Design a protein around this ligand. Structure first.
Ligand code: FE2
Ligand code: FE2
Ligand code: MG
Lengths: 194, 194
């Protein structure tokens, strides 16, 4: 049956950097695990699904079943995109590729910030590498939208901007939440996805 | 400049019935009033907007400006759809129209509940009247979607199911929040909209 990996850094791992044990706990135990529970129920009454992976489902299914699998993938990628020892600017190959695609880190950061803060309704802000060209791009998905449906767009980083991701700690202030996201970006994970 | 009417029953009006001073205050002062502030900002940039009514903007504009006006209307309709002395089962005209369209109040309640609880992402659950047939229907919109963009459709009632509407008091439990909505439904307002 479907399961998800534990938080890489534990329920309180980001508390000192502005995502509280309580915010993270609700987000993981209620929202993320809830999607897993719902997908497992759906597989009992849709036998085709029991043999598909999360990724296979995202690529081949649509509607509510897609939303469950995609939300599972997106949330796991989101926790892996954050780290208590992250933040600041990337170095090495990640820095090189960001500079080549966006001009500078500051320009990349402005574009991602404005997309993340400006996304209307529930969604996800992404950094992706478009393997059609090699160029990095800022990209947003709506609701459970997942870059895997556009197979050229390799995911590097995501920030959940569903209100449930930040409302506990930040209430309506998504801008403040995104500033916090920058303080915890896991550049090591981004480098692994290149 | 654009403005919104005050809450009909005060910031703490629904607290005894399950929507707290804090939940309602954030929702009205930050989100609802926030949309008004943003629309007025847009109107200084574009003077043609400033003379249009909220409903005119909803019918004619698209994109971000639409989202602002539609959210302004949807939220006012939402506050008018609730009342501390409401809840329970309607009587008179509204009851007759609900019974004629859905068979019974119980059947209507079950349909509206399931649409409201099941809406994926940000959105709104509505009771509307088709003005061609007079028949009432449960109708959902996504994000800022508003029944006024559809032909021959009059809004009667709405429940906001964006996560900010319930996350302070209910967190992930939207089902519990919708049960609370049922305890405050303003059937007097629905009667005025028939
Ligand atoms: Fe989330
Ligand atoms: Fe709202
Ligand atoms: Mg993985």
């Amino acid at each position: 049956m479907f399961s998800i990996p534990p938080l890489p850094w534990g329920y309180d791992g980001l508390a000192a950097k502005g995502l509280s044990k309580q915010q993270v706990t609700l987000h993981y135990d209620k929202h993320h695990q809830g999607y897993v529970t719902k997908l497992n129920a759906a597989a009992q009454t849709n036998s085709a699904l029991a043999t598909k992976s999360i990724e296979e489902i995202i690529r081949t299914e649509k509607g509510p079943i897609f939303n469950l699998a995609a939300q599972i993938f997106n949330h796991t990628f989101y926790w892996e995109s954050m780290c208590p020892n992250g933040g600041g600017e990337p170095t090495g190959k990640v820095a090189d590729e960001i500079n080549a695609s966006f001009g500078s880190f500051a320009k990349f950061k402005e574009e991602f910030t404005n997309v993340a803060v400006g996304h209307f309704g529930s969604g996800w802000a992404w950094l992706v590498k478009d393997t059609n060209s090699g160029k990095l791009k800022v990209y947003q998905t709506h609701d459970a939208g997942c870059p895997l449906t556009e197979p050229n767009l390799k995911p590097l980083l995501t920030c959940d901007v569903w209100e449930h991701a930040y409302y506990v700690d930040y209430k309506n202030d998504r801008a403040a939440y995104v500033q916090t996201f920058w303080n915890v970006v896991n550049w090591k994970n981004v480098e692994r996805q290149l």
